[PDB]
Design a protein around this ligand. Sequence first.
Ligand SMILES: C[C@@H](NC(=O)c1ccc(C#Cc2cccc(F)c2)cn1)C(C)(C)O
Ligand SMILES: C[C@@H](NC(=O)c1ccc(C#Cc2cccc(F)c2)cn1)C(C)(C)O
Ligand SMILES: *[C@@H]1O[C@H](CO)[C@@H](O)[C@H](O)[C@H]1NC(C)=O
Ligand SMILES: *[C@@H]1O[C@H](CO)[C@@H](O)[C@H](O)[C@H]1NC(C)=O
Ligand SMILES: N[C@@H](Cn1oc(=O)[nH]c1=O)C(=O)O
Ligand SMILES: N[C@@H](Cn1oc(=O)[nH]c1=O)C(=O)O
Lengths: 780, 780
Amino acid sequence: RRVVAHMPGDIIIGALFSVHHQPTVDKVHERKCGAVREQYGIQRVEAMLHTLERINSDPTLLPNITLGCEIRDSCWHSAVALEQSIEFIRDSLKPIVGVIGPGSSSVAIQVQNLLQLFNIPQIAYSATSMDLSDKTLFKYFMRVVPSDAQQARAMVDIVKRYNWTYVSAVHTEGNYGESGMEAFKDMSAKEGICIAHSYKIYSNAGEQSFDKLLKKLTSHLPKARVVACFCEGMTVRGLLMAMRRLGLAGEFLLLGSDGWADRYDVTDGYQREAVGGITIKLQSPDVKWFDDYYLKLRPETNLRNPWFQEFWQHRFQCRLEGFPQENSKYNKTCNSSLTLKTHHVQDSKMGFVINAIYSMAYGLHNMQMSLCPGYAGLCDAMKPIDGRKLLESLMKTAFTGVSGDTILFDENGDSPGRYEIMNFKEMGKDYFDYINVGSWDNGELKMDDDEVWSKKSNIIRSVCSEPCEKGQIKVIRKGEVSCCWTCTPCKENEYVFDEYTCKACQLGSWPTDDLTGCDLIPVQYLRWGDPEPIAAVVFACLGLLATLFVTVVFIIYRDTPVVKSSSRELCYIILAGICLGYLCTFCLIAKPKQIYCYLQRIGIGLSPAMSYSALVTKTNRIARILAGSKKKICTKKPRFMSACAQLVIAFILICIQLGIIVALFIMEPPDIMHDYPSIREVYLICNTTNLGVVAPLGYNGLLILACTFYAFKTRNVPANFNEAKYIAFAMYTTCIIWLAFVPIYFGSNYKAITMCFSVSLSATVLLGCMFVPKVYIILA
Amino acid sequence: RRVVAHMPGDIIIGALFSVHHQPTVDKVHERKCGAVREQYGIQRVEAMLHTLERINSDPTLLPNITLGCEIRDSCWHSAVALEQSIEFIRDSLKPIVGVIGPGSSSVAIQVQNLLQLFNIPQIAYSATSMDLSDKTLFKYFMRVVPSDAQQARAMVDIVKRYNWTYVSAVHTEGNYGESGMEAFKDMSAKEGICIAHSYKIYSNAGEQSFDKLLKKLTSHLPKARVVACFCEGMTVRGLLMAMRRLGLAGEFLLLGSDGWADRYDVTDGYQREAVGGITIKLQSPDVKWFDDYYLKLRPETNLRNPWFQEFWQHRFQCRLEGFPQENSKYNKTCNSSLTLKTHHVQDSKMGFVINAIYSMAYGLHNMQMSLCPGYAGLCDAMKPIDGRKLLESLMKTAFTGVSGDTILFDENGDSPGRYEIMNFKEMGKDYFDYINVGSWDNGELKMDDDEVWSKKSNIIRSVCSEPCEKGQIKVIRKGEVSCCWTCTPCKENEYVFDEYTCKACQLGSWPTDDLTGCDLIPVQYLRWGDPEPIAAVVFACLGLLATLFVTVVFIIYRDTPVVKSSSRELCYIILAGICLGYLCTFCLIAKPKQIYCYLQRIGIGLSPAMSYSALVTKTNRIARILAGSKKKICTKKPRFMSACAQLVIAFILICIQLGIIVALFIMEPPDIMHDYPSIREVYLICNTTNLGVVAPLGYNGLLILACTFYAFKTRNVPANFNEAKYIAFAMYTTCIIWLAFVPIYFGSNYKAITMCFSVSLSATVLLGCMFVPKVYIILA
Ligand SMILES: C[C@@H](NC(=O)c1ccc(C#Cc2cccc(F)c2)cn1)C(C)(C)O
Ligand SMILES: C[C@@H](NC(=O)c1ccc(C#Cc2cccc(F)c2)cn1)C(C)(C)O
Ligand SMILES: *[C@@H]1O[C@H](CO)[C@@H](O)[C@H](O)[C@H]1NC(C)=O
Ligand SMILES: *[C@@H]1O[C@H](CO)[C@@H](O)[C@H](O)[C@H]1NC(C)=O
Ligand SMILES: N[C@@H](Cn1oc(=O)[nH]c1=O)C(=O)O
Ligand SMILES: N[C@@H](Cn1oc(=O)[nH]c1=O)C(=O)O
């Protein structure tokens, strides 16, 4: 059988403290537990044994009745604790009216499942998992500490404050670890946090298991540099030992939990691997009277604690010769100068144990007051202490704890509590310590980012991918966790609306500077100004000046003998054609509008006919004068009427041209098209079809052929300075110029400027080859 | 307080059967159980009570000693079962040497946690969770059924066989449901399957909880029509009741598990909502000798079963007034005419219970034979039966079960087993039943897809997205479950490398049909055929005919005064230049090849330059001999240069042209560029560049300018048939022929046909306007 601590009293209160370490992986079946514990063992045992004495001494609490205890060792194991609980309830098969629950959540659950069948309230001081908050399954369970829902919140707040996204999760196999990690995973995946992989491991696992776990952790080392540990102290210690073994000294950031807290026994010897790690600790002020009592304990006088001799020998490596527990393993003896003061560290969860004991005592006191207000002691209506009544009294009892605050239980049996954020840092040389760097209280996460990471240099944030949101590059997530993405540029034609997809502008638009919204690229027109249009306007102006000068000379030299052979009316039509051609370019080089491109077409059509048809009829006559004279045998042939015939021949040729232009205008009406050659640029012009520029042009070319043919007939006939010869050069040059612009026209969409220049050149060639004699011959 | 079945014996075997239903959500704390169960209760109790008597009667098994029992009710609850186990082990604090474990996995775990402390082996018949396979925590636990890993595999196989990807998961709160659903999730999400959402719910949850669960399930109804239920019978029944209540009668296909199997008590009354459900059932042949004992049981004679009278009154709604149990609740009495034969259904797992009891008996037999081979009975070395020895003997025992096969335990305490796939179908009008449609045995899923869905119009597949392998249209996953994707068509330019990306080919290439891969664009070279090149070569042939005709006429009249005006050798290299220019056409329009690639270049370089050189060297003399004649003061220097030096002064600068063209040539070898004008088409051309084409052209232009200047010097001069004027006009028109094609060349693609036309035009205009006149009347 196992040894237990005893204390006589009227009412007996059970206890389950992990005096010894958890059984090793190979000694589980034998249910033998390992070395003695100081913080979790002897300290808590002494704390209870002294708190009971304090309660007994106090008259204002539980008067006239003394409180006893039966403290048993759980060895931090479910199997051992269940055995001890069976020993507790053996009498029910002095009764145990209540127990101070074990530290572990899984162990607490196992013990509660047995205790609830006998109506024995259980108060825990460190059991934290959310699973114990279910009063349907755990009616007789209370704790003086909050659930680990708040702890998971605090951890999520920590990971979100430092912009850690691609973290890794490790938790101890059990109930505390499982519940904690589930809650953390939920609240982390909710906001924006992603887990590379979740790993689980027993505390008492071998070296090989921890090595494999750390290899798996390092499999994501370059990216996931922060590990979320909902792990016990032994799990963290095993991780540190693995880090030491395989040569990791600070490329992980361990985010601890309540299990780690500020325990010095999890980092002793392996400090350098755990430096920089952040842990969450339940806030509990150090108890002073407990220290005053504890630091004066000696093995010689302290008999009521059965494990104290073993602990004394284990702490100061020595053998106590005078007592049965010699443990001759240790070499040296224990001199009478060893004190517990040296290297004394009180456990963090010391206030909670005293608070739990006080809560049980106050519950009993309240129930005793409520049952028999008159009698001072154990009234007859209590001797069979009813578990249900005690539970009901405990669920509503309130008192002032050792810390100074008021302790009360909510509907779920929990108690209010706040957390302290501690960062493991190196103070000096070969001197590490836990430093308080923040707190968490009902949602607010106060922190001190100056103490943690002295320099802005903060542990490379656990990010699965660098921010791809810079410019045109777009985010594409693969068939993996939706926190890292491939960063790809989508073509500049497109713009990014969603971070994960981009679309292009329809036909005539472009993305803005920010690549959020098309900008409808500006339309380019012919634009008065620009070198080539200015040259066109200059040429048009000079041409118009020449035309008006020639017209002036003609309307001054009306009926001069020299100008009598040519048809005066027909020459008027010639000048009209030339002037209209010169006006056509002025109309054409401009902003396209309905009004402008209504009459640019009639210009380009009518002018080269209104001149060239009249030239045809003029040359025809001047040939008929000579061609008819070749025979000179007998010709009563006034077939063609001097001018009468010539003018109507004109007014029919020009009118058929006008008819064809009007038809081509009617069937194809002019609109202001916004033709899009490329996605880059947008132009606007009036709709021209192939027909609209090939039919009138073809007809004009036919007139060119007619004039040239007739000019070749007449060639070098003696005339007034041989004007027919001038017509010869006129038509030769006109045909050459017409043939010259074919490539540039049917090559570049430079339709407008080439058309303008062609019309101007054709006009100036006539205005030159003709009238040149008329300007200086008559000048003579 | 709770009743117990008894049977006297030397060795007592415990049992835990769920005789009554699970305590209701209100009465959990009072641990008062529900109504009686037939399949899971009385039938199993009677099975044990009869199989023990069969074993006792058998002389070849457990000889000379009797086997007793102590059957207790667990009410399918962990709290009640723990109390009953405490009652079991109270004697250890006649001992119970071992128990036949409870049906539920969680309940089995709770019972085992207590039993392993007292070395009491536990054999389960329906516990299936994987958690019980861990011998570290459950050393004294064995099962005659396989773990639920195989069950999860079977379910994954079922969902894989029917294209189901986007399913929803439900599991019962507990250990069986949790382990099953975790295993299923792992092996489903691993391979190809998707889960819309995983839901958990307690079996004894209220109507409201089931309503909320079904609302959440319907929230994904259009896409996820298959529900994977790793749920108990009561959970499935609750789901069916919810479906009936909110009028959901065929939307879902429930995929059951061992909990459902082919139980008629989970679908009775609510058949119409469960039709078309597929369930997995552990194969176990019906035990024939059990029926012949069970069907003859009557309440009057069966006194050894404490629950039999209550069950009799519950099954046939009647009050057995005669007996202590009357339960007035049932109005009518029962005549002595009701038999268990009517509506008799033996449960699926009757074979497993009998096999477990036989396993325990055979274990005891083997251990007895090993301990004392000589004595037949309870030898003195066996009075304190050791649990460890019994466990060791049980872990290696093998025997023949009721079915006929051999029952043995592996290292983990499990047993081999095969699964049977059952389908809930409507056979006839007002008739439903389970139909065996498949099996699963060590990864082999033999199904019959004809009995289920007797057509091709099966259940709408639980798929989130239709197969989007439609040509290009890639898949884009939107952060949620891979399963659900949008469809974007990817650009013609590019093709699909994988399902999730589309990349473009090289600078010159096209994706093949159905965008599968990539191909090479055929090179469409400038064919010897085609519309334009045939005209070009016709023109070249006519030009060459002109050259040979002119050369012939020159050879006919060599020393005639009408020809002997200038150096006849100059008007030999003129024709040489013309011929070479015409040959440039033939050496240009062809397949771009190494040889032709320099031939064309040397042609275009030398020929026009060398022709115009000789024209220059003729015209300077013909101008200067009369330029000096204009003044003629003395000018008695007939030589100057003149004489036959003309040929030398032409040839030196022709060699200069050859030198410069060789200079351009040495930089660029006659290779072929694969010019890419657009993404769609690929062309090939010679290695000519801007620098390699603009220098010889520029030099030739300089010669053109020089010759034009000299032609302007001469123009109209009286000589033999007036050569100068015609050649001057020829050069004038040539100057602008050289300029017409410039825009459509330097920046174009058809720069071969343009060259072909330009050289021919320049050749005809230079020949037809230089020699033609001289040879027009060459006859005279
Ligand atoms: C560019 C194109 N040219 C023309 O489409 C065109 C149209 C009209 C004229 C003219 C004229 C003219 C002539 C004399 C007097 C006058 F007022 C006007 C020239 N070219 C082609 C034929 C390819 O060269
Ligand atoms: C098409 C192109 N023209 C030429 O690159 C080119 C090169 C050579 C000639 C010639 C010639 C010729 C002239 C007389 C006799 C003879 F044998 C050959 C014309 N154009 C550009 C510059 C755009 O005008
Ligand atoms: C974390 O949050 C954002 C991430 O860019 C940034 O504004 C902030 O400075 C980061 N760092 C800290 C210490 O908050
Ligand atoms: C989907 O099911 C069909 C038959 O129901 C069959 O082609 C195969 O099992 C599945 N399809 C594929 C592509 O595997
Ligand atoms: N809340 C923790 C308590 N605790 O865990 C440890 O590892 N030490 C310790 O005190 C748990 O539920 O286990
Ligand atoms: N397979 C279940 C057992 N079981 O659940 C039911 O609903 N019926 C039944 O036999 C388990 O492993 O706990």
